[PDB]
């Protein structure tokens, strides 16, 4: 029930330029064959 994916968003700003990395990372997916996150923290009492 997991899937680790290494992703890289390569970018090139012009047709004359080379393809360069713009973003990269990993993706860890909890998947099914077809409350997952912590409940949000209680709102801070004082807030301007």
């Amino acid at each position: 029930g997991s899937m680790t994916i290494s992703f890289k968003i390569d970018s090139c700003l012009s047709k004359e330029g080379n393809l360069s990395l713009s973003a990269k990372g990993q993706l860890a997916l909890t998947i099914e064959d077809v409350h997952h996150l912590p409940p949000p923290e209680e709102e801070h009492p004082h807030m301007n």
């Binding site: 996150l37 209680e42 004082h46």
Partner: protein, 1210 residues
């Protein structure tokens, strides 16, 4: 999602606070987690409007780190973000720095008449060298004089005086002129004697230059070549100008004089003529800060302008390069007449026979009252500089006056000539009492036009006190012919029926009963009447900032009045001792001197201290600004690590090590950590070593000054640095030379690692160690023998010579199967795969320890421990030499790497100031705990969002007990729980500081709450009535002052005992920048803030910690944020700068540190007996970079007190 990211920035920076001084874009995210089902459900359901929460985890400034949580209306988290590292689009250069901090840099109201500094006197070496060269010549100087002048005529006439334009006479006359010095029995041997003298310091640059010129002047003796280009274009000429303590101290006094002038006069359009190489320019601009609006680098020739541009690039924006021939009219050369407030003559007036006309040209360029700084010759002495000065090409031009060259004019004849050319005489001069300063003695002269007067009626109020009576009599006797009105007190003025509207008031009421101590008796209305009839005003106070805070309240009231009534010229004079005359009359005369186009600064306020006048200037305190910005960028400051704590901190990314300022800033808690010893580290281990479950501690070897003994010691330090403060338990105090320099620390480090490894594991009967340090192996074997444990050594290079990438089957074949624990000490991390394969072949469940589990770059005992460590080390000392791996801290920081921890490496911390004075990456003032856990910190008046933020910051910085006090604390108990989660017990006292009884009840309730004694107070109660004083009413004054004034008085009287068992670590009183510049309609507030400042200053003078912060508009939190006045205050952005919530915390921390430093220096016999000694206690803040383009909108730009904060325009 980008909006969610913007939430992090919003948390980091409030709207209008300008905390986000640079554009941050995301560059790394530790984790983004999204629940696609919930996001799709929200998208399809149409309830796009969703809630969010975000934590700005890291906000120092280098890169923001945010943790975001976006949830639906039902609080079902749609997605979250963890450590979304926002980083600047481009590195945060100094242009993005925040210059909020400022200090009251005090200086003389006029430049000192005599610049006699013992630090700049001719040293013994120079004072012997000059008489030594005299000894060569002094015998027959009387006969020499004329011949020496003849030789000095090499440029114009000496080549004909004896037909010395021809080869024979040239060769004869060169050596004859040198013998004019060497004749008395020394002669040619003087050639070698000169070198012998040059072998020592203070002899080389001068007499070596003499020797060099004496061996090549033959072509110049006949006037056929450049006098100095023959000397390799320079051999020592610049060194002679700078290094020699005859040409040097003149430049030092020039720097001092220019500093004084640029302090009293700021935004000056300066112009140095004859700079050449710019040595004088270098020295004068070496001042930490000076109020030069512009600096015209000028010389007769433009050949030096490239060198000036390269040397003075930092001041290039301030500096403009324009050639000028003072022998020629400046107007013909493109310069604007009377456009410069200051002109500097860098030893150039001697190079013109038109001295009078050149000085007239300088006057033409100078504005009325401008200062001409003259570095020039005077009071000639033949036996000291003659034959070497005589060579130059144009310096002799000037002999037309009848004396040698352009005459060595005496200061009296300098005064005569200077007056003849349109100036106010030589009122300042450099000391030339004995010698070595005549050749370059400096003088300052004012441009005499609309000169200081030294008619409208003069009104005197006060005179009740006997000293006030004496001063009134002195005013009467010294006042010029003017209409005069006199009143005993201000009530008498209130009873007055005829008061001129053009009155020039001289108020001595503060020397008598003060206004802000007796406002009840219609004194406020009398002050209103005064302002109504006051067009000019002078006020006198007796040590207000140190003895009489009420007089300081009056000073602040006048400070605000000068803003409310700009047409009303006001001066205030605070005197430490009134008995110590004649200066109040001159200030009163000045008040009528409303010169707008003249350089004369209007002197808004003055202080007579130590029998001398002083004027303050709010110069950016670059120390505190650098500390604040170090949180945001790598601020580097030259710090002496040998005498200041400098830790070789590891970078946040753990990419490299850098030297960081480790100054703890006087944390007073040393009883729980009993007798925290100070260690001056000579050698230390870069990596922190783990101990027996106690934690990671670096190994440091150094000296401890036990009754001045440099006792060698080896200790475990949490803050590896040049200087450490460590508990005695973690110290080995033996001075055994076997623990030799460098090597001893190496062995102790290795043995600490080995002992840790053996102790944590032992339970086991046999273990394995992978790639241990070369020294380590034998030590580990010794420890195993001493603890009865079979330790196996594995290395990737007896030892088991394994290899990285070895097959698991090979490991099974070779590795013993009795191992129960594995310890990987491999500095190279490539052996991680080998370790993993070991885990598959070793005993299942085998304990695994990595190098990170014993060695780390971040840290954040039984007496027998170090005894065992040293006993083990003494077994294996011979394994290596002492200096097996020794590198200086600078080399380690520049070249060492965290990812490759070179175990068994040792840092050689420099000890000499020359070796230790290094560029250290400054540390934020709040980067380390500043507060003790056994004391209560009382935030008086701090219960709004500002107070809550300050309290939470305090607890984050070691404040385990905080008390918030206010007349109506509306604090959520949930916030109290939140701060308690941070580790500090916070309570609301509901204490009305306005009443003594209420304060006493609250302080007794503290004991009822069992809280520790109050170790610090943050006094910031506030009430505002924005109305001008004339339209103000006494009840408003009472409402504004009583909270402030009465609260400070009550709290001081409560803690007015420096001998008490619980002296306050600090007494921070929250002042507004209006207390330093005023504001329209806040006279009461400014007076109260000045009362706070004066009370803090006198409390420090009393031996009690205290400080004041002159805060700007706090957009982040507090009055501006809670009143929703961001637009209104940003409309005056150019007037008051923003002070962010966390910047406010930084300012408070800096004020606390300043107070503690002042107290400790007082323990070091710092008197703090006057205002000058307490420039740091008033942490001026909130003044933005003053743009002249906005000078019209700025209602206080004309104030010279802020001169150094004015942006240059030309």
């Amino acid at each position: 999602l980008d909006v969610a990211f913007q939430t992090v920035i919003g948390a980091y920076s409030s709207p209008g606070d300008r905390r986000l001084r640079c554009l941050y874009v995301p560059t790394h995210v530790d984790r983004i987690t999204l629940v696609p089902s919930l996001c799709l459900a929200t998208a399809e359901s149409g309830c796009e409007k969703v809630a969010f929460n975000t934590i700005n985890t890291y906000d120092k400034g280098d890169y923001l780190s945010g943790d975001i949580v976006v949830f639906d209306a039902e609080q079902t988290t749609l997605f979250q973000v963890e450590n979304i590292t926002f980083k600047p689009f481009s590195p945060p250069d100094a242009s993005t720095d925040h210059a909020m901090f400022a200090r009251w840099s005090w200086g003389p109201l006029t430049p000192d008449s005599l610049l006699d500094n013992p630090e700049y006197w001719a040293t013994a070496q120079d004072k012997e060298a000059i008489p030594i060269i005299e000894r060569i010549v002094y015998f027959y100087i009387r006969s020499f004089l004329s011949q020496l002048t003849l030789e000095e005529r090499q440029q114009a006439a000496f080549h004909l005086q004896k037909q010395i334009e021809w080869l024979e006479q040239v060769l004869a006359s060169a050596k004859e002129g040198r013998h004019l010095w060497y004749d008395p029995g020394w002669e040619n041997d003087t050639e070698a004697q000169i070198e012998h003298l040059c072998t020592a310091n203070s002899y080389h640059p001068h007499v070596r230059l003499v020797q060099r010129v004496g061996q090549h002047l033959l072509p110049t003796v006949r006037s056929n070549g450049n006098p100095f280009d023959l000397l390799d274009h320079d051999g020592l000429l610049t060194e002679f100008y700078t290094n020699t303590l005859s040409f040097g101290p003149a430049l030092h006094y020039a720097r001092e004089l220019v500093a004084q002038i640029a302090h009293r006069y700021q935004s000056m359009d300066i112009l140095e003529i004859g700079a050449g190489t710019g040595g004088a320019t270098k020295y004068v601009l070496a001042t930490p800060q000076l109020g030069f609006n512009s600096y015209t680098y000028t010389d007769i020739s433009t050949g030096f302008f490239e060198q000036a541009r390269e040397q003075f690039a930092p001041f290039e924006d301030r500096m403009v390069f324009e050639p000028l021939d003072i022998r020629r009219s400046p107007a013909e050369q493109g310069f604007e007449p009377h456009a410069y407030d200051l002109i500097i003559a860098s030893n150039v007036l001697h190079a013109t026979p038109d001295l009078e006309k050149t000085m007239a040209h300088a006057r033409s360029l100078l504005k009325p009252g401008g200062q001409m700084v003259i570095l020039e010759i005077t009071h000639k002495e033949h036996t000291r500089l003659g034959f070497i000065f005589g060579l130059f090409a144009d310096w002799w031009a000037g002999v037309d006056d009848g004396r040698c060259t352009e005459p060595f004019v005496s200061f009296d004849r300098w005064d005569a000539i200077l007056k003849r050319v349109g100036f106010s005489g030589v009122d300042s001069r450099t000391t030339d009492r004995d010698a070595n300063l005549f050749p370059t003695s400096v003088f300052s002269t004012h441009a005499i036009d609309a000169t200081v007067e030294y008619y409208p009626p003069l009104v005197v109020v006060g005179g009740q006190t006997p000293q006030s009576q004496r001063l009134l009599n002195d005013i009467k006797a010294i006042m010029p012919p003017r209409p005069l009105q006199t009143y005993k007190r201000l009530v008498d003025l209130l009873d007055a029926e005829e008061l001129p509207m053009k009155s020039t008031f001289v108020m001595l009421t503060e020397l008598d009963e003060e206004l802000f101590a007796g406002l009840t008796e219609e004194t406020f209305e009398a002050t209103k009447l005064l302002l109504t009839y006051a067009s000019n005003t002078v006020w006198l106070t007796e040590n207000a900032w140190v003895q009489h805070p009420h007089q300081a309240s009056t000073i602040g009231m006048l400070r605000s009045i000068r803003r409310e009534h700009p047409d009303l010229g006001v001066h205030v004079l605070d005197v430490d001792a009134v008995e110590t005359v004649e200066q109040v009359l001159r200030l009163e005369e000045h008040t009528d001197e409303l010169a707008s186009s003249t350089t004369w600064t209007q002197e808004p306020e003055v202080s007579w201290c130590k029998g001398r006048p002083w004027i303050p200037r709010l110069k950016r305190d670059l120390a505190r600004n650098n500390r604040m910005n170090s949180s945001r960028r790598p601020i580097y400051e030259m710090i002496d690590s040998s005498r200041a704590p400098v830790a070789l901190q590891t970078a946040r990314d753990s990419s490299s090590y850098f030297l960081e300022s480790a100054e703890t800033w006087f944390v007073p808690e040393s009883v729980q950590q009993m007798e925290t010893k100070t260690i001056y580290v000579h050698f230390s281990c870069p990596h922190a070593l783990r101990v027996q479950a106690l934690g990671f501690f670096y190994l440091v070897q150094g000296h401890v000054q036990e009754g001045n003994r440099e006792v060698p010691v080896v200790a475990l330090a949490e803050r590896n640095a040049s200087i450490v403060h460590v508990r005695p338990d973690y110290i080995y105090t033996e001075a055994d030379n076997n623990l030799s320099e460098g090597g001893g620390s190496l062995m102790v480090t290795v043995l600490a690692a080995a002992v840790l490894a053996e102790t944590v594991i032992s339970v086991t009967d046999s273990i394995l160690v992978l790639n241990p340090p070369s020294i380590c192996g034998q030590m580990l074997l010794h420890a195993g023998e001493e603890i009865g444990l079979q330790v196996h050594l594995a290395t990737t290079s007896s030892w088991l010579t394994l290899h990285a990438r070895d097959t698991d089957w090979h490991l099974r074949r070779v590795l013993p199967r009795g191992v129960q624990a594995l310890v990987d000490l491999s500095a190279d991390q490539s052996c991680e795969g080998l370790t993993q394969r070991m885990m598959k072949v070793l005993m299942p469940g085998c304990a695994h320890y990595r190098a990170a589990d014993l060695f780390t770059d971040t840290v954040s005992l039984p007496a027998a421990y170090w005894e065992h460590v040293v006993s083990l080390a003494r077994q294996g000392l011979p394994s290596v030499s002492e200096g097996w791996e020794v590198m200086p801290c600078t080399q380690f920081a520049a070249h060492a790497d965290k990812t490759r921890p070179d175990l068994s490496t040792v840092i050689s911390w420099p000890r000499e100031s020359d070796e230790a004075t290094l560029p250290t990456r400054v540390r934020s003032i709040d980067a380390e705990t500043l507060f003790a856990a056994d004391k209560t910190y009382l935030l008086v008046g701090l219960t709004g969002d500002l107070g809550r933020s300050l309290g939470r910051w305090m607890v984050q910085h070691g404040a385990c007990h905080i008390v918030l006090t206010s007349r109506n604390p509306q604090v959520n108990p949930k916030w109290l729980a939140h701060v308690e989660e941070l580790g500090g017990r916070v309570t609301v006292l509901s204490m009305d500081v306005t009443s003594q009884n209420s304060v006493e009840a609250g302080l007794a309730k503290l004991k009822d709450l069992h809280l520790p004694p109050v170790g610090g107070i943050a006094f910031g109660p506030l009430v505002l009535q924005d109305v001008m004083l004339n339209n103000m009413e006494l009840p408003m004054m009472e409402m504004v002052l009583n909270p402030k004034v009465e609260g400070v008085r009550i709290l001081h009287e409560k803690f007015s005992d420096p001998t008490s068992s619980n002296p306050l670590d600090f007494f921070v009183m929250f002042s507004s920048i209006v207390a330093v510049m005023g504001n329209p309609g806040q006279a009461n507030y400014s007076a109260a803030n000045c009362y706070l400042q004066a009370l803090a200053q006198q409390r420090v003078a009393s031996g009690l910690a205290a400080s004041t912060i002159d805060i700007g508009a706090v957009y982040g939190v507090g009055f501006v944020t809670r009143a929703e006045l961001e637009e209104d205050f940003n409309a005056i952005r150019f007037m008051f700068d923003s002070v962010e919530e966390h910047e406010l915390h930084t300012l408070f921390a800096e004020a606390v540190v300043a107070g503690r430093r002042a107290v400790h220096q007082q323990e070091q016999q710092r008197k703090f007996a006057t205002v000058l000694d307490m420039a740091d206690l008033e942490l001026t803040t909130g003044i933005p970079p003053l743009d002249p383009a906005l000078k019209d909108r700025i209602t206080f730009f004309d104030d010279p007190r802020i001169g150094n904060l004015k942006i240059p325009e030309y």
